[PDB]
Amino acid sequence: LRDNIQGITKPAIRRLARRGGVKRISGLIYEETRGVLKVFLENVIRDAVTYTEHAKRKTVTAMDVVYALKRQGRTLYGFGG
Amino acid sequence: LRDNIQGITKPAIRRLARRGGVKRISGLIYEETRGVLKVFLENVIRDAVTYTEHAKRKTVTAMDVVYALKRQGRTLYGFGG
Amino acid sequence: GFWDCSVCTFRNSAEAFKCSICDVRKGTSTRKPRIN
Amino acid sequence: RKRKESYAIYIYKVLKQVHPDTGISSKAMSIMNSFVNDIFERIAAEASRLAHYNKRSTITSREIQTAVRLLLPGELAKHAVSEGTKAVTKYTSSK
Amino acid sequence: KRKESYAIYIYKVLKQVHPDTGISSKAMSIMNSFVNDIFERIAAEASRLAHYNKRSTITSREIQTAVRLLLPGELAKHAVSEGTKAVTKYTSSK
Amino acid sequence: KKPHRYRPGTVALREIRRYQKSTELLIRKLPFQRLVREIAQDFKTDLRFQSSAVMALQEASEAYLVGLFEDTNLCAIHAKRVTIMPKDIQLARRIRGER
Amino acid sequence: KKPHRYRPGTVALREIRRYQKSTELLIRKLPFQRLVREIAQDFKTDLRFQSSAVMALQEASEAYLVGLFEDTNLCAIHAKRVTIMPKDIQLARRIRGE
Amino acid sequence: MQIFVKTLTGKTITLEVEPSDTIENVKAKIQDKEGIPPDQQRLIFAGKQLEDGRTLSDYNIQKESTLHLVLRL
Amino acid sequence: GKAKSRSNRAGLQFPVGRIHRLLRKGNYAERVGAGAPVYLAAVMEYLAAEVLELAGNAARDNKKTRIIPRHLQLAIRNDEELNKLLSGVTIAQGGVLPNIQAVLLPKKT
Amino acid sequence: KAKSRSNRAGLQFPVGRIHRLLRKGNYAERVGAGAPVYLAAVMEYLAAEVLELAGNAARDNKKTRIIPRHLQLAIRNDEELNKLLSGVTIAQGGVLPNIQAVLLPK
DNA sequence: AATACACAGGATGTATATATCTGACACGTGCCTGGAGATTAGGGAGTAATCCCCTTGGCGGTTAAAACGCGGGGGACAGCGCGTACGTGCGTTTAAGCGGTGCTAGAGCTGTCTACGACCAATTGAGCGGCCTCGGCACCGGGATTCTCCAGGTCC
DNA sequence: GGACCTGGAGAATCCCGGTGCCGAGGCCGCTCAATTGGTCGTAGACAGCTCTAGCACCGCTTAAACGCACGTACGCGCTGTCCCCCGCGTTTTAACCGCCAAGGGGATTACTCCCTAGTCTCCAGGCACGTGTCAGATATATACATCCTGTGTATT
Ligand SMILES: [Zn+2]
């Protein structure tokens, strides 16, 4: 666990953009996408670990993530609750 | 009580535009702004009047307006509650 | 059987789930399809 | 081994009552379960707030009706209000 | 018909921080609304945390976790410090 | 001979500074009150309004409109222009989620 | 003599249709899981994750990225273009309120 | 005979026809007014798709009839 | 006589008594009336029946019998009021609707 | 021979009133002892921060009283407070002075 | 001989100082409802102890996907010319706004009194967990149709 | 000669059968949570009264809205260039599926006891009125600060 943000490879971002409907992609989009994804993940995982620590647990469950997303305004259907 | 939407004169829309930071304004912005304002007011007044109807009252108060705004993510400070 | 359409007014086959003419999807028993 | 309640059987019964020859997958059932839970919690919270505003201590069918009239769009709200009124009237006139 | 609000406490805090400064009525109303909003947000988050954890009691730990979940960055750290100090002062004095 | 005439742009900037420095209602109060009464007339007949309710409605409406115009200006600047057109409002309201 | 070569802009539309009809996960699972473990390390030492947790995180993140790209495409088309650039992403994130 | 064509767009196009007239002439009159060729024109009335080889009287079309036009491409 | 569940009495399928218990123990008020669970059960039943009926019609088109998340996703996003009600919801394994802007399409007559 | 709990906690905000509001507010079946104290302390700190900033703003503007304009300025100029109050509008508050660079004649 | 560019002067606009006068804030007084203190008691939550399900680390092989390189075409971006659509300013026109008076509808409280919801104990059936199949759906294989794309013919 | 038109080749996707695995679906046994019956207190409906404040109307200033004229700057269309990204190919690389092994920690059960709900008594903190001074709003007069047009003249 040293540097894995680069694991979101260029073809993966291209595929996600294709599902988004984008025809042509400039060469500077990949760093921007990586930064945006990192920020989103940081927020959600911070909330999830806060819930996990309050419950005196050591394992992050699916309900922790669902609640973290629920408080952030993006509810998720298909994992419980 | 007819065509009272026209009471929002062009100088008023220009004044509201200036406070937002706008320099040049096209000649077809005023109708768009009137439509936007009408839809927004329809939503808020609908919520306020149904709050008033549940309370078995015949007067729309400031608390009803604040509650209508609160349930739309538009919290207002300075009229109580 | 069949199901009439609120848009194209053309009767559609019972075992059809869209209008073969105006492409409007089959509506629910209570709520009818929109203008478009 | 410990009981864990859900809305599965009621969703399945309504599905069979609408589509006699159609099944459902596990993930789709989970999604419908979450949908029903979300609707319940939304309406209950709105009714609670609206009862507290008027300095009342009980929530009744009128509060649920007003919450439905507040939370749903037009046609959906109208049909749900009709369904609720019919259900309550049938429930009252039976012993 | 005794209505109540937070006016006197906000005035006392203001005079504690700025001895020679006043406040208008509409600023008073805005501060009242701000206080009520903060109270309701933290109370609702603590209630949700209690319900999630299969408990029926709201304690200081629920309020601490709610404040951490609701306030950003430095605000949360300073609020947590203030709450811990207030509780540990209230406990030591019978 | 020729009266003093400012070039196009100076008076607009002057007005921008003026109305960004002040905090007063920019729509005449009575026409807005009449509009409010018109809109509510279609939800309940013989309704009555407290004055503070009308003031709250006006404050919220002005805040919303100023924010929308700010977003419209940003979108217009993105498209390499200075003027605002209805398509800018439409793009801002589409991205926001109001349509 | 010349091997078949599609004109630029035709394989892209095919990819758009293909990925707009499917409902799979477009990111490799193992690198995303490693990224999740790296980010969560900065908050608590020696954490553990349920498989459902990682799956929910991945699904939510991909939905968010697809929505962002939709808005970015709208912004790029607004400026009379076809190619998306970081300006469009920044304008979308500014208007959305992030 | 006066007939109104209630196109799905929302326009009530009006034309003059004859009770024994063929559907082809009725279709051609729309092309005269709008420009839509008869090949691309679809006419809906009482859940029946008219054919150019038939006539108005064959479909039991009475006075003040209302028709619908659908573009199928 | 024999016991008769309140759900059967009200002519519903969703559990009136279970919803009553959830209302009672959910910290919503001091008291809960009698008709409130009945009204709530009717509303939830109707809102579930609409989605299930549309999803069934969608599934039958695809020459399938088993309902999957994709059918629900399509039914919700294509309806206007249903989309409005669920505008801030993400459905796992649902995908997106097919949509390509007109300017990106190639030359058309 | 009665000492208020607010005085004991070292606070200026009420404690018994907040305890009553929690008890009757339908938040749980029970309310602990230190919960109202913690809540009151947090609210007092937030109010003190906002009032200090607004008072500094008014003094620099050559005033004695605080008006909503000063509150709006202090709130919107602080990143943490702006994030905490991202959904709230202040009546008679105005807006920050902001004009885009490309609109200026240079 | 030409043309730009800094300078000088007129000119509006804004910022500063000074007098005044009015209404909103700050303080005092009285009292009444709500917080504090003491005492009782039942259950919520802490805590030790046990079992086993699920998470983590490891190794091997198979192969699709990611990484690197190359050739060219469609698009991004700069530059220029036109024209028309807003911005600025001036002379009328309309209607908001301030002040005042008069009417009464409807909020807001107070006093009764009964129907309705909470609480408890017993008991019976609805709903959950574990099992055991089959038929829907996924995957493979093969051919058939649809959709691009460039190389020549011919007409304008 | 060049642009419009077409034909043939080629790649990609779709339709049709055939085989196989496992997840949905119905059953069986149990057990606990919904139901029935009775008791008891109070929340809420209903009526009656008081009095704030919302509505309507009038009358007069006077700033704001309105209509028109003129010109200039900006929006839009067109053209040309060049380098960046797309499509395809070949060589690496690490994701993925499969087993096996170990133990940390979620989940549950039983026991003890402290903390909070509920009650009554007492009294002072906090609120509603009432009153009066001064901060701020408004009017007036200088004085500084950007905006614009015209010109001298030096550079080219
Ligand atoms: Zn149809």
mmCIF file of C-alpha atoms in Angstrom, chain B residues 1-5 7-9 11-26 28-29 32-33 36-42 44-46 49 52-53 57-62 65-66 69 74 76 79, chain F residues 8-9 12-13 15-16 19-20 22-24 26-27 31-32 34-41 43-44 47-50 52-53 55-57 59-62 64-66 68-70 73 82-86 89-90 93:
data_model
loop_
_atom_site.group_PDB
_atom_site.id
_atom_site.type_symbol
_atom_site.label_atom_id
_atom_site.label_comp_id
_atom_site.label_asym_id
_atom_site.label_seq_id
_atom_site.Cartn_x
_atom_site.Cartn_y
_atom_site.Cartn_z
ATOM 1 C CA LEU B 1 -55.588 39.523 -10.456
ATOM 2 C CA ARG B 2 -54.450 38.939 -14.042
ATOM 3 C CA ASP B 3 -51.064 38.961 -15.825
ATOM 4 C CA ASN B 4 -49.387 40.135 -12.613
ATOM 5 C CA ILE B 5 -46.176 38.366 -13.685
ATOM 6 C CA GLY B 7 -45.137 43.507 -12.693
ATOM 7 C CA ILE B 8 -41.553 42.234 -12.515
ATOM 8 C CA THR B 9 -40.260 44.964 -14.794
ATOM 9 C CA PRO B 11 -35.221 47.330 -14.815
ATOM 10 C CA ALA B 12 -35.796 45.054 -11.812
ATOM 11 C CA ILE B 13 -34.438 42.007 -13.657
ATOM 12 C CA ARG B 14 -31.477 44.103 -14.797
ATOM 13 C CA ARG B 15 -30.891 45.181 -11.189
ATOM 14 C CA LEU B 16 -30.975 41.581 -9.967
ATOM 15 C CA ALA B 17 -28.554 40.659 -12.757
ATOM 16 C CA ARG B 18 -26.134 43.417 -11.716
ATOM 17 C CA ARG B 19 -25.928 42.122 -8.141
ATOM 18 C CA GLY B 20 -24.847 38.759 -9.581
ATOM 19 C CA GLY B 21 -21.997 40.353 -11.525
ATOM 20 C CA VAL B 22 -23.284 40.504 -15.128
ATOM 21 C CA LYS B 23 -22.193 43.117 -17.688
ATOM 22 C CA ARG B 24 -24.131 42.453 -20.919
ATOM 23 C CA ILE B 25 -27.709 41.158 -21.065
ATOM 24 C CA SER B 26 -29.535 39.844 -24.124
ATOM 25 C CA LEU B 28 -34.631 37.531 -24.432
ATOM 26 C CA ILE B 29 -33.470 36.946 -20.834
ATOM 27 C CA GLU B 32 -36.770 33.186 -19.153
ATOM 28 C CA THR B 33 -36.343 34.831 -15.751
ATOM 29 C CA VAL B 36 -38.124 30.551 -13.650
ATOM 30 C CA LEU B 37 -39.562 32.830 -10.966
ATOM 31 C CA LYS B 38 -43.113 31.630 -11.629
ATOM 32 C CA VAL B 39 -42.142 27.958 -11.256
ATOM 33 C CA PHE B 40 -40.150 28.604 -8.064
ATOM 34 C CA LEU B 41 -42.997 30.574 -6.485
ATOM 35 C CA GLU B 42 -45.529 27.906 -7.481
ATOM 36 C CA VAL B 44 -42.967 27.277 -2.454
ATOM 37 C CA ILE B 45 -46.521 28.630 -2.235
ATOM 38 C CA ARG B 46 -47.980 25.159 -2.816
ATOM 39 C CA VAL B 49 -50.590 26.606 1.613
ATOM 40 C CA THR B 52 -51.641 26.128 6.344
ATOM 41 C CA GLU B 53 -54.449 23.761 5.320
ATOM 42 C CA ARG B 57 -56.053 28.025 9.538
ATOM 43 C CA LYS B 58 -57.043 30.640 6.967
ATOM 44 C CA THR B 59 -53.848 32.724 7.074
ATOM 45 C CA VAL B 60 -50.404 31.967 5.647
ATOM 46 C CA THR B 61 -47.835 32.887 8.290
ATOM 47 C CA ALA B 62 -44.063 33.280 8.167
ATOM 48 C CA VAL B 65 -43.144 29.815 4.492
ATOM 49 C CA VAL B 66 -39.988 28.954 6.438
ATOM 50 C CA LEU B 69 -38.392 26.505 2.282
ATOM 51 C CA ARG B 74 -33.460 26.465 1.046
ATOM 52 C CA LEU B 76 -33.890 30.891 5.641
ATOM 53 C CA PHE B 79 -38.000 35.317 10.391
ATOM 54 C CA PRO F 8 -20.345 51.200 -23.246
ATOM 55 C CA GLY F 9 -19.120 49.298 -20.212
ATOM 56 C CA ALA F 12 -22.537 48.706 -16.113
ATOM 57 C CA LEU F 13 -19.433 48.225 -13.953
ATOM 58 C CA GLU F 15 -23.899 49.613 -11.272
ATOM 59 C CA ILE F 16 -22.299 46.240 -10.520
ATOM 60 C CA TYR F 19 -25.666 46.834 -6.237
ATOM 61 C CA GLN F 20 -23.018 44.442 -4.942
ATOM 62 C CA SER F 22 -25.942 47.296 -0.926
ATOM 63 C CA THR F 23 -28.435 44.944 0.732
ATOM 64 C CA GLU F 24 -31.891 46.231 -0.216
ATOM 65 C CA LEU F 26 -34.516 45.156 -5.785
ATOM 66 C CA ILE F 27 -38.092 44.298 -6.826
ATOM 67 C CA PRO F 31 -46.102 44.141 -7.608
ATOM 68 C CA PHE F 32 -44.408 41.153 -5.973
ATOM 69 C CA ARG F 34 -49.779 41.009 -6.166
ATOM 70 C CA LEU F 35 -47.924 38.199 -7.948
ATOM 71 C CA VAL F 36 -47.820 36.186 -4.713
ATOM 72 C CA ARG F 37 -51.568 36.633 -4.277
ATOM 73 C CA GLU F 38 -52.170 35.608 -7.898
ATOM 74 C CA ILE F 39 -50.187 32.380 -7.592
ATOM 75 C CA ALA F 40 -51.797 31.341 -4.293
ATOM 76 C CA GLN F 41 -55.298 32.076 -5.622
ATOM 77 C CA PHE F 43 -54.636 26.652 -4.398
ATOM 78 C CA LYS F 44 -57.227 28.086 -1.976
ATOM 79 C CA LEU F 47 -56.677 33.212 1.383
ATOM 80 C CA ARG F 48 -55.061 35.817 3.620
ATOM 81 C CA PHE F 49 -51.368 36.564 4.120
ATOM 82 C CA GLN F 50 -49.275 37.980 6.924
ATOM 83 C CA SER F 52 -43.856 38.855 7.184
ATOM 84 C CA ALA F 53 -44.734 35.853 5.005
ATOM 85 C CA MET F 55 -41.289 39.479 3.004
ATOM 86 C CA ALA F 56 -39.852 35.986 3.535
ATOM 87 C CA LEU F 57 -41.039 34.905 0.089
ATOM 88 C CA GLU F 59 -36.111 37.442 0.301
ATOM 89 C CA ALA F 60 -35.875 33.776 -0.693
ATOM 90 C CA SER F 61 -36.873 34.517 -4.294
ATOM 91 C CA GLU F 62 -34.254 37.235 -4.689
ATOM 92 C CA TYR F 64 -32.419 32.231 -5.670
ATOM 93 C CA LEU F 65 -32.482 34.567 -8.682
ATOM 94 C CA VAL F 66 -29.132 36.162 -7.813
ATOM 95 C CA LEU F 68 -28.976 31.601 -10.815
ATOM 96 C CA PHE F 69 -27.686 34.730 -12.562
ATOM 97 C CA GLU F 70 -24.222 34.119 -11.095
ATOM 98 C CA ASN F 73 -22.595 34.454 -16.029
ATOM 99 C CA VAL F 82 -19.474 38.402 -22.299
ATOM 100 C CA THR F 83 -23.240 38.358 -22.850
ATOM 101 C CA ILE F 84 -25.764 36.022 -21.218
ATOM 102 C CA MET F 85 -28.354 34.230 -23.360
ATOM 103 C CA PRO F 86 -31.214 31.855 -22.493
ATOM 104 C CA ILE F 89 -29.615 29.748 -18.060
ATOM 105 C CA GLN F 90 -30.786 26.423 -19.471
ATOM 106 C CA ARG F 93 -30.412 24.798 -14.564
#
